[PDB]
């Protein structure tokens, strides 16, 4: 329906479009994110069409940069670009400035594009609709391990432990408890499988699921091949 | 300097009912013959016939060119495009590009096909349209196809003599020329039939 | 199928409903001038009425000038006449620039009129609800004289020459008065005092209210003095005096 | 120019302009490829031999690079716009960097054509499906497959077009893993048949081997659809 | 800008825009033409709006150029446009090609024009049909163009409000080896048996190709016709 | 229907009713007056407080244009800022390209042609806001004013605001041939405190501002010990 | 304003282009055209409005490219149009342009599959950006390459062009149809071909003792080749033969429609 | 190129030669070089004839459609002032010197557009590379409102000083006259130098220029 425009605002302030595809989030799978002193990790779950795909293709977890890891839900159409968007200007970040960039302002680089959306082409070509995807970035530069949440609003927000997709209602009531601050790397692990098994109508299999780690005194991304998934849930 | 890089002249003449155009056969890279067997005629129909002469490159890149316009009106415009329109239209495209010009010299000759009228045309590598009533000629042996010319022609000439005047005219002037020769084509049209000619040159 | 009337479209029966609305706006400021020419001068009256009394009464106008030689009123709605001047203004300039001579006035009520006819094409331009009026005196051939043109442009474009011109408020009884008067007289023959007295006479006979000096301004081009200037109170004062016998 | 917003989310989250993309795509001809150990095939409806078109052959599995072969479902003309853009960007990468196309790049830049449709101005989404399979430049079979709505995804034995989910759950119970180059066309067509009518004359098959790709002639599918189909009856009289 | 388009096709197939645009561009003042052997003759019908309107300046038949005539029955504003646009293009083409511009060339040129504009973004069709005459290389011709695009190579043809009954006249007083006078005086006939009162030298415009050229026709030389027929 | 909701689109009687209820809008807006005093003009505004927090010196509706003229923006205050920045476009081009102070009536008739290119196109709402300029040029004191509806008139005393009718039939009793700015910036100053209702705005005050040959032909606030307390 | 736009280019609910189906049946009113492609040339045989008594035609030199029905593209492609007609001459113009340009750029005649896919692409791009209608016009090319001999094809308003060994649009294109794919083998030459033209074209208009001044006929074979200058290009190789489109007059198919109406009645003598 | 032109009592008189060099040779001996602008308005020119053919057609075809437009005859300022623009906006690569001359309802106008731009209305004027050798002719004969037959000796006479005093131009005088009315354009008003020492006609009986392979085409 095409009554109210793309940038049309609604009584209750909110503009519709945006309201809207936030509301299409809670239609995609679920992802985790947690930070903790040892390093932050993220977890999600593929939620194939099929038995027959070969499942090494729809990773959830896209690496932005060696440090640099982000997760994400709703519609993976976009996401490929928001992701793209990313790697070049963590790029164009170490090429000019010859250091890693910080995921503060990978966050800042994803919003920035996500907010240019509108009709009207005149001077510059926009979207004609935000992106149904809402981010998470997960990294470790010098202000220590960092998760940052990104809605398709253009507004970054940093976290300590986050759930996006369907059943992320549920996994906030997960989070209000067991989590203290200053956890243990395998205790995120374990908190984090647990969450998937609670969440999910499928049966939680090491081939099912995709966990990233990124450590805070290796500062590199590592992402779990499925046997070490199986020594998690092996616990 | 850059319009006798492939050497090459053309020369045609006008008879009663009728007119010859005739070519050399020497292609180079203005002094080594690269071949000896290209003519300088094209063909657009039954009663016209133009020549080119100039940079090699640019030669077959008018051609191109004026092919494509000439299939292209043939098709709009239901008929054989005549003479004075041929020639005025590739004088416009030869001004077009004023200060990137072409360096061809192209030399126009036609017949009206039932009125009787011979109408023959060289423009200038910019443009400049030049008509005249006897005989036009371009090329490296430009003033020596003049002299010869001024000194042949006659009025009222018919075919069979036309082609003799021609002939003897392009082959005296290619040879006080070194960047001519190699024997030469002739195509002498008249109101009925078209005849091609190949006239036996020194192959100096 | 719904709307046909919101956009330039055209309607069943074949019209143009926002052109024909406009002519609805031209006749909504209850204003009416006469445009007349006589023998050697055009003349253009206009009501100018301030019902308002603290409005300065040299502020607001209907005359304009487009060029030294060519002047024009304004019909209709009061912004839109002003913006129309102003595009005339404009192909002067270019006109005077491009050719070096000064613009014809049937060239420019031509392209005045070319101009109206875009906006009743494209959907999203409003179409100007003015009628315009162009005077002026120009050369003619074979002989050199000046003869006097008066050309009207309507919100649709149909641009065209006349004798005595009449728009906005009640302009089918003005223009019922103008034709009755010409059966009898030949309008190419008078002078421009008889002239501005069947003009006056046409506008009194419209609205019926035995019109003041200061209710109208009177613009004219004469042969004399080719250019268009208004003339004076004291001038209209004369014709008023003898319209009153 | 004309850039109005034309896919935009509905009240629900749901962009109808890709849903009913999706939905002309499940009103076209089917296309089952599946991949095998060391040679992948594709097989096309081709809608009729209606006894009127040119005797002459012309193929339904479009070359998109010399070692890339496509198989579209969806609108006709959306699939040729797209599958000459796929083959002008297979010839600029190799012209970039002197090395021939890899199978993932080409989906993933048709992937990312087919998502910039849904995000642009004035432009509708393809309404096509595409099947891509071929061999990188160290064998390794690949085969993917795209939505209108830009989600590529590689699989290992994929159908497109309609009756889609019954083709697909019915061969995902019957894929053996590292199947041989004549398991394949036997694999090939018993599947693509169960949506098909009987007539022998409606399909176009493909295998495809590491710097070979062949079409199947007339003789060679009618010797393998004749095994097909008494190998169903088979089953049929088992399930009886 | 508006870009986008105002017609549009329709369940039935119509391009309903185009069938109103049709209709506008045939509630105009009555035109017609005929052909003979030796030339054309448009003649259109000058409707005054009133005594006021200086007959002189109004015009309904429009040389396009030294060879080319055309006259109009429909938006006299909309068809100001195409003979703007139809001048120009006879121009380029003697610039371009030094000879007068074939008619079927300008009619093809100036066709496209209506098909532009039924296929643009923003713009309605137009609303007005002309009458191409004149002579080229291979002989006369009289073309009659419509709003959504079409020609026709007629032969003696009337547009307007009361053409059925203006072509069902032509179609009995036309004669294949008519002179060119001869074509005249039908043409005045057949509006005069029309013609609302009694047409004078200022109530009509005629314009009759002859040989070379356009010519339209003075106010004597079309009164020495008016009062002999 | 629907004939009233672009600015293309005039009514069945000729009406653009956009435009009518733009001017509505400014019908509303607070309380302005202004007097052209032969020697000088004088412009008095109305400011409404809608906070007692609010520092003086903010929401002043009476904005310079150039050295000699002044804009005061009766209606939607944004919009008002949007005209005075063309205005002074406007102004700074002819003391550019021209070398010479913009006359008054050329600066209201550019005013009033910016406004009204506002309210033809399908894609701009008309202006909010009814602007009066007070220029001294050459030319002597001018007072023009400029409606949504893009239409200019020049005035010897103009009145606009929401209380409109009654304080206009003060300045109909004024003189306005022997009126000096002088005690024009007193006689505005109680007009408006007069026609000023106190039990709707808790909170509202007077802005006064002036150009004559005793601020050497320049338009500036006036001192602030000459306003009269109420 | 975005209010009244009319969205041609959007999906319905179920993935159909409105717009697309709209030209569709537009296209069904038309004047029906029938092409037939036999082995030794091929036939475009159509029918052109009743004549009314006043209509001229225009007196054109060499009138071998453009008729009523059928216009040529190049010197080897001819085709035929059905549908909205002053809309089809903007794609006509733009297919000879294309088929100008390739000739311009590779100097050898373009071959009739690339020419119809590249007058196809600029269909399909308004039913996909603009938000304008798009083309409601459908094509009939019939031409002769090195490639594939005497080719045929067929466009539909929306982009998607195919291949046909006997093909018909317009008016009961269904009955000619089924007319046409029962008669019709590959052992058939032009001058049957003709044959098989008329008589099922004279079926689905209606007409016993077809008529010449309803009927167009335009065919499309190789003649013997005739400009071969070769003493201007001695090394230019020019073909024997060479394909000419021509479209038939009075004088030449009045001796092919009094054998149609007599094999006419020869098949209706035996239907007792 | 040598080009002339005199403002007579009523109307004006242009004159030209006819010999075009390309180069230091006589390529045609009686090229045109008295244009067409309008029914009453004529524009000779020098200088490269590219350029003046193309200025000269563009403003010609621009002018007609003008007249088209408005429905009178054009002025000779129109023209000269579109000449002038076009020709001041190249800063001068457009070369083409030209004489321009009319007549109007404001009398005869003759006008000279030097190829940067600049223009000049005098009394007579004129351009070319024989330019000084006419113009010291015009100005020891010219007399104020001369008739017409004065004009035209005056003219060949000017001309004639070109043609036997400069190399780039000669044999012929092309004179058109302009009046109010007409305009006649008389192109062989005098020819001086004549066909003297007449030709021989060399006889080449048919065949005996050798022949190798021919291959005729009838139509």
């Not at chain 8, 030669?17 to 009686?30: H, L, M």
């Not at chain 8, 003008?66 to 002038?84: D, M, N, Y």
């Given at each position: 329906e095409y009554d109210r425009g793309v940038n049309t605002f609604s009584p209750e302030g909110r503009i519709f479009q945006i309201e809207y595809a936030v509301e299409a989030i809670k239609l995609g799978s679920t992802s985790l994110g947690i930070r903790t002193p040892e390093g932050v990790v993220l977890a999600a779950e593929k939620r194939v069409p099929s038995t027959l795909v070969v499942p090494s293709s729809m990773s959830k977890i896209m690496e932005v940069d060696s440090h640099i890891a982000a997760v994400m839900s709703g519609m993976v159409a976009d996401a490929r670009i928001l992701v793209e968007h990313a790697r070049v200007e963590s790029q164009n970040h170490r090429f000019t400035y010859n250091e890693p960039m910080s995921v503060e302002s990978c966050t800042l680089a994803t919003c920035d594009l996500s907010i240019q959306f509108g009709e009207s082409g005149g001077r510059r070509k926009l979207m004609s609709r935000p992106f149904g995807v809402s981010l998470l970035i997960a990294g470790v530069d010098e202000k220590g391990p960092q998760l940052w949440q990104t809605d398709p609003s253009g507004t970054h927000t940093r976290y300590d432990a986050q759930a996006i997709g369907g059943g992320a209602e549920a996994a906030q009531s997960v989070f209000t408890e067991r989590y203290h601050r200053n956890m243990t790397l395998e205790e995120g692990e374990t908190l984090a499988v647990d969450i998937l098994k609670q969440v999910m109508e499928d049966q939680l299999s090491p081939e099912n699921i995709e966990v990233a780690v990124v450590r805070a005194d290796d500062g590199k991304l590592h992402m779990y091949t499925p046997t070490e998934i199986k020594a998690i849930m092996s616990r | 300097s850059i319009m006798a890089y492939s050497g090459g002249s053309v020369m045609a003449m006008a008879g009663k009912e009728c007119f010859v155009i005739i070519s050399d056969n020497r292609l180079g890279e203005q002094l080594k013959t690269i071949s000896t067997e290209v003519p300088k005629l094209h063909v657009v129909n039954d009663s016209i016939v133009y020549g080119l002469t100039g940079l090699r490159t640019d030669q077959q890149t008018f051609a191109n060119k004026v092919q494509f316009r000439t299939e292209m009106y043939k098709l709009r415009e239901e008929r054989d495009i005549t003479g004075k329109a041929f020639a005025a239209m590739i004088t416009s495209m030869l001004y077009e590009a004023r200060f990137g010009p072409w360096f061809v010299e192209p030399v126009i000759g036609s017949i009206d096909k039932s009125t009787g009228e011979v109408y023959l045309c060289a423009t200038d590598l910019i443009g400049a349209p030049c008509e005249p009533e006897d005989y036009v000629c371009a090329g490296t042996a430009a003033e020596s196809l003049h002299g010869m010319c001024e000194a042949l022609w006659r009025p009222g000439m018919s075919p069979e003599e036309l082609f003799e005047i021609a002939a003897q005219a392009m082959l005296s002037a290619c040879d006080r020329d070194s960047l001519s020769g190699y024997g030469a084509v002739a195509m002498i049209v008249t109101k009925d039939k078209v005849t091609t000619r190949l006239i036996k040159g020194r192959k100096d | 199928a719904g709307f046909d009337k919101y956009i330039t479209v055209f309607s069943p029966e074949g019209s143009l409903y926002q052109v024909e609305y406009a002519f609805k706006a031209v006749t909504y400021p209850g204003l009416l001038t006469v445009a007349i020419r006589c023998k050697d001068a055009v003349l253009v009256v206009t009501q100018h009425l301030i019902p308002d009394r603290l409005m300065r009464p040299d502020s607001v106008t209907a005359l304009y000038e487009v060029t030294p030689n060519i002047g024009c009123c304004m019909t209709g709605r009061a912004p839109d006449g002003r913006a129309l001047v102003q595009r005339a203004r404009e192909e002067a300039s270019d006109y005077q620039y491009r050719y070096g001579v000064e613009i014809p006035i049937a060239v420019l009520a031509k392209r005045m009129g070319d101009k109206a006819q875009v906006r009743t094409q494209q959907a999203g331009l409003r179409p100007m609800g003015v009628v315009s009026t162009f005077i002026g005196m120009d050369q003619s051939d074979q002989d050199g004289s000046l003869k006097p043109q008066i050309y009207t442009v309507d919100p649709a474009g149909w641009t065209g020459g006349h004798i005595a011109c009449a728009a906005g408020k009640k302009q089918v009884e003005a223009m019922a008065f103008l034709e009755k008067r010409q059966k009898s007289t030949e309008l190419d023959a008078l002078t421009q005092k008889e002239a501005a007295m069947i003009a006056l006479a046409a506008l009194q006979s419209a609205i019926g209210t035995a019109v003041k000096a200061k209710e109208v301004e009177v613009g004219r081009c004469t042969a004399a003095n080719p250019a268009f200037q208004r003339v004076p109170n004291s001038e209209v004062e004369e014709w008023l005096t003898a319209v009153a016998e | 120019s004309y850039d109005r917003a034309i896919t935009v989310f509905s009240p629900d989250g749901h962009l109808f302009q890709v849903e009913y993309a999706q939905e002309a795509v499940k009103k076209g001809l089917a296309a089952v490829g599946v991949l095998g150990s060391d040679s992948v095939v594709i097989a096309v409806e081709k809608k009729s031999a209606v006894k009127l078109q040119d005797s002459r052959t012309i193929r339904k599995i479009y070359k998109v690079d010399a070692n890339i072969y496509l198989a579209f479902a969806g609108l006709s003309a959306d699939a040729r716009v797209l599958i000459n853009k796929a083959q002008l960007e297979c010839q600029r990468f190799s012209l970039n960097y002197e090395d021939t196309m890899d199978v993932d790049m080409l989906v993933r830049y048709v992937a990312g054509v087919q998502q910039k449709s849904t995000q642009s101005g004035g432009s509708r989404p393809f309404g096509v499906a595409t099947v891509i399979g071929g061999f990188n430049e160290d064998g390794k079979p690949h085969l993917w497959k795209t939505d209108p709505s830009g989600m590529c995804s590689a699989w290992r034995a994929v159908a497109i077009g309609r009756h889609d989910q019954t083709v697909i759950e019915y061969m995902e119970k019957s894929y053996k893993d590292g199947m041989s180059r004549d398991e394949c066309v036997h694999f090939a067509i018993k599947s693509l048949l169960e949506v098909v009518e009987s007539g022998s004359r409606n399909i176009e098959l493909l295998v495809l081997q590491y710097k070979e790709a062949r079409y199947l002639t007339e003789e060679e599918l009618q010797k393998f659809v004749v095994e097909v189909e008494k190998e169903r009856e088979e089953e049929a009289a088992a399930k009886k | 800008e508006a870009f986008y388009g105002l017609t549009t096709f329709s369940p039935s197939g119509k391009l309903i825009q185009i069938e109103y645009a049709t209709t506008a561009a045939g509630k105009g003042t009555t035109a017609l033409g005929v052909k003979a052997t030796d030339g054309v003759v448009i003649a259109a019908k000058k409707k005054a709006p009133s005594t006021l309107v200086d007959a002189s300046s109004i015009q309904k038949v429009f040389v396009l150029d030294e060879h080319v005539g055309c006259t109009y029955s429909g938006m006299g504003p909309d068809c100001r446009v195409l003979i703007d646009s139809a001048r120009k293009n006879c121009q380029q083409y003697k610039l371009m090609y030094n000879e007068p511009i074939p008619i079927s060339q300008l009619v093809r040129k100036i066709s496209a024009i209506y098909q532009e504009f039924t296929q643009s973004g923003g713009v309605r069709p137009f609303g007005c049909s002309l009458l191409v005459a004149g002579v080229d290389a291979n002989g006369y011709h009289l073309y009659q163009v419509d709003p959504s695009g079409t020609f026709w190579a007629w032969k003696a043809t009337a547009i307007g409000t009361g053409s059925p009954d203006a072509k069902a006249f032509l179609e009995k007083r036309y004669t294949v080896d008519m002179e060119l006078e001869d074509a005249v005086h039908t043409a005045l006939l057949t509006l005069k048996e029309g013609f609302d009162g009694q047409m004078t030298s200022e109530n009509t415009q005629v314009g009759r190709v002859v040989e070379n050229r356009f010519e339209i026709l003075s106010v004597d030389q079309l009164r020495d016709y008016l009062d002999q027929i | 229907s629907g004939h009233d909701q672009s600015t293309d689109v005039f009514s069945a009687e000729?009406?653009?009713?956009?435009?009518?209820?733009?001017?509505?809008?400014?019908?509303?807006?607070?309380?302005?007056?202004?007097?052209?005093?032969?020697?000088?003009?004088?412009?008095?505004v109305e400011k409404v407080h809608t906070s007692r927090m609010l520092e003086k010196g903010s929401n002043n509706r009476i904005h310079a244009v150039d050295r000699q003229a002044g804009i005061c923006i009766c209606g939607l205050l944004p919009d008002g800022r949007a005209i005075v920045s063309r205005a002074r476009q406007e102004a700074e081009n002819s003391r550019d390209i021209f070398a010479t102070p913009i006359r008054g009536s050329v600066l209201a008739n550019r005013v009033g042609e910016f406004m009204h290119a506002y309210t033809t196109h399908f894609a701009y709402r008309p202006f909010g806001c009814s602007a009066i300029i007070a220029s001294y040029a050459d030319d002597g004191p001018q007072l023009f004013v400029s409606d949504p509806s893009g239409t200019v008139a020049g005035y010897y005393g103009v009145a606009l605001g929401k209380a409109k009718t009654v304080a206009k039939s003060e300045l109909e009793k004024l003189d306005f041939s022997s009126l000096t700015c002088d005690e024009a910036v007193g006689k505005l100053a109680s007009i408006l405190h007069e026609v000023h209702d106190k039990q709707k705005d808790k909170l509202y005050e007077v802005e006064v501002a002036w150009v004559c040959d005793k601020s050497d032909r320049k338009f500036v606030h006036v001192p602030a010990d000459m306003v009269p307390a109420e | 304003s975005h209010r009244y736009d009319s969205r041609t280019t959007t999906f319905s609910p179920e993935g159909r282009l409105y717009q697309v189906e709209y030209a569709v049946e537009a296209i069904q009113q038309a004047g029906t055209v029938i092409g037939v492609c036999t082995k030794d040339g091929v036939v475009l045989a159509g029918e052109k409005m009743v004549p009314h008594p006043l209509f001229d035609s225009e007196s054109m030199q060499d009138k071998n490219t453009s008729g009523e029905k059928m216009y040529k593209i190049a010197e080897h492609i001819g085709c035929s149009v059905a549908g909205v007609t002053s809309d089809a001459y903007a794609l006509l113009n733009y297919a000879r342009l294309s088929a100008l340009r390739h000739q311009y750029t590779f100097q050898e005649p373009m071959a009739i599959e690339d020419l119809c896919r590249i007058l196809c692409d600029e269909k399909q791009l308004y039913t996909q950006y603009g938000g304008v209608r798009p083309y409601g016009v459908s094509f009939l090319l019939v031409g002769w390459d090195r490639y594939y001999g005497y080719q045929l094809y067929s466009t539909e308003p929306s982009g998607d062009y195919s291949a046909w060994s006997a093909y018909a649009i317009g008016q009961n294109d269904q009955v000619a149809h089924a007319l046409l794919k029962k008669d019709w083998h590959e052992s058939m030459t032009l001058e049957d071909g003709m044959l098989l033209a008329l008589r099922v074209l004279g079926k689905t208009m209606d007409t016993a003792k077809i008529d010449l001044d309803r009927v167009e006929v335009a065919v499309m074979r190789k003649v013997p080749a005739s400009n071969i200058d070769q003493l201007l290009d001695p090394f230019k190789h020019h073909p024997k033969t060479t394909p000419r489109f021509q479209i038939l007059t009075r004088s030449e198919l009045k001796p092919h429609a009094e054998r149609a109406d007599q094999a006419r009645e020869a098949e209706e003598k035996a239907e007792a | 190129?040598?080009?002339?032109?005199?403002?007579?009592?009523?109307?004006?008189?242009?004159?030209?030669?006819?010999?075009?060099?390309?180069?230091?040779?006589?390529?045609?001996?009686?090229?045109?070089?008295?244009?067409?602008?309008?029914?009453?308005?004529?524009?000779?020119?020098?200088?490269?004839?590219?350029?003046?053919?193309?200025?000269?057609?563009?403003?010609?075809?621009?002018?007609?459609?003008?007249?088209?437009?408005?429905?009178?005859?054009?002025?000779?300022?129109?023209?000269?002032?579109?000449?002038?623009?076009?020709?001041?906006?190249?800063?001068?690569?457009?070369?083409?010197?030209?004489?321009?001359?009319?007549?109007?309802?404001?009398?005869?106008?003759?006008?000279?557009?030097?190829?940067?731009?600049?223009?000049?209305?005098?009394?007579?004027?004129?351009?070319?590379?024989?330019?000084?050798?006419?113009?010291?002719?015009?100005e020891a004969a010219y007399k104020d409102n001369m008739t017409c037959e004065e004009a035209k000796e005056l003219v060949a006479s000017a001309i004639r000083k070109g043609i036997f005093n400069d190399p780039y131009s000669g044999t012929q005088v092309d004179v058109c006259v302009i009046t109010k009315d007409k305009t006649e354009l008389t192109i062989g008003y005098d020819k001086p130098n004549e066909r003297m020492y007449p030709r021989q006609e060399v006889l080449l009986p048919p065949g005996t220029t050798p022949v190798l392979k021919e291959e005729i085409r009838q139509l």
């Open positions: - | - | - | - | - | 000729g009406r653009v009713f956009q435009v009518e209820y733009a001017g509505k809008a400014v019908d509303n807006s607070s309380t302005a007056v202004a007097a052209c005093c032969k020697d000088g003009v004088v412009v008095a | - | 190129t040598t080009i002339v032109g005199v403002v007579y009592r009523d109307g004006v008189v242009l004159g030209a030669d006819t010999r075009a060099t390309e180069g230091s040779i006589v390529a045609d001996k009686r090229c045109r070089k008295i244009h067409y602008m309008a029914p009453n308005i004529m524009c000779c020119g020098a200088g490269t004839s590219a350029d003046t053919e193309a200025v000269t057609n563009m403003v010609s075809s621009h002018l007609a459609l003008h007249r088209l437009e408005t429905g009178k005859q054009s002025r000779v300022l129109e023209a000269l002032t579109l000449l002038k623009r076009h020709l001041y906006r190249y800063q001068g690569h457009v070369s083409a010197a030209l004489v321009l001359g009319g007549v109007d309802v404001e009398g005869p106008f003759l006008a000279t557009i030097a190829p940067h731009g600049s223009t000049d209305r005098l009394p007579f004027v004129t351009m070319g590379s024989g330019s000084i050798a006419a113009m010291a002719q015009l």
